[PDB]
Subunit: 90 residues, 4 copies
Amino acid sequence: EFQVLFVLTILTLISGTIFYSTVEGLRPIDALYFSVVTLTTVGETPTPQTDFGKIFTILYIFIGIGLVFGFIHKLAVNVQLPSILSNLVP
Amino acid sequence: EFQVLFVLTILTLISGTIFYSTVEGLRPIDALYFSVVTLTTVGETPTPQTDFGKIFTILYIFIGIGLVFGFIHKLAVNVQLPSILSNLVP
Amino acid sequence: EFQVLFVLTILTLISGTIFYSTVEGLRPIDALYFSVVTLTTVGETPTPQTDFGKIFTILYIFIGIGLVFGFIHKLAVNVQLPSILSNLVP
Amino acid sequence: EFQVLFVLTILTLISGTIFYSTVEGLRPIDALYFSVVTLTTVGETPTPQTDFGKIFTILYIFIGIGLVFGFIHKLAVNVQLPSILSNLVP
Ligand SMILES: [Ba+2]
Ligand SMILES: [K+]
Ligand SMILES: [K+]
Ligand SMILES: [K+]
C-alpha cells in the first residue's frame, strides 16, 4: 500500500528529473526540486523556458498531483499518525 | 462523470487561455500555463500586470479550483487507481 | 451556510487588503491579489518586504486557509455541482 | 488533539527556521516565512540556493505537509467552526 505509492512517486519524480535536466537543461538537483515543488503544488521554480517544458509541466501536474498527495496522505495517516498515536500512550 | 469533469476543465482552461493572451498579451502557451498552475494552486507565473488581469485571476481562482481538483480527484481515483489496483493482481 | 462562508471570506479578504495596502504600501488591488493567492495557496506575490508583513502573512495563512477552502468546497459542491448535475438532466 | 498537532507544527517550523537561517544564511524571520509558505503549499521564497537547501526542502515538504494540513484542518473544524457555529445561535 504505502510501498506502492512510494515506488510510484519515486518513478514519477525520476521521470520529471530526467525531463527537466534534458529539455530545460537544469542540473539534476534543480530538475528534481522543480518536479517536487510542482507536484506538491508548492511552487514552480525555475519556470520552464521552452514550450516543450511548459506543455510537459501542464500534463505532469494533472497526472502527478493525485499520486503525490495520495502518498503524502498515507505517509501521514498510516505512518506518521501511528508513530505519534502509539507514542502518546503512557 | 469523468468525461463531464474533463470537458468542464478543458472549457475553463480555454477560457483562461483566451483571457490572458488577450488582456495580458501572453503567447497562448504561456496563457494556458498560467491558467493551469493557477487553478491547480501550483503557482502564478507570469503574475498579471493589469488590474483587469488581477481581478479576473481572483474570480478565476475561486470558480475554477473546485472544478479542477474534482477532475484530478476522479482522474486519480476512478482512472489511475483502477489501472494500478487491477494491475497489481498477479 | 454558503452565505455565512461567503461573508466570512469577504471579511477576511478585506482585512488582508487593508493590511497590505497599509503596511506593505501596496495599491488596494495588489493587496487583494496577494491576500487571495495566499489564502488559496496559489502563491505569494509580491512577497512582503517588512518583518511585520511577513509575520502577519504567517498568521494570516494559518487562520484563513481553512475558511477559504471551506467556501470553495461548498461553492463547488452546494452551488456548482447542482447547477451542472440538474442541467445534465435531459 | 489540537494541542498535539499545535506542538508538532511549532517544532517542525522551528526546525525549518534553524535550518534555513544556518544553511541558506537567512534572517530568522525569512527562514520561518520560507518554512511556513512551503509547508502550507503557498509558495517557496526565497528559493534555496545551495544543493543542501534544495535537498532538505524536498524532504521537509514531504514530511511536513501532512502535519501542517492536519493542524489547519482541526484548527478550522474543531476550533473555528464551533466559535462561529455556536455564535450563529440567536
Ligand atoms: Ba503554490
Ligand atoms: K498549493
Ligand atoms: K508559488
Ligand atoms: K514565484
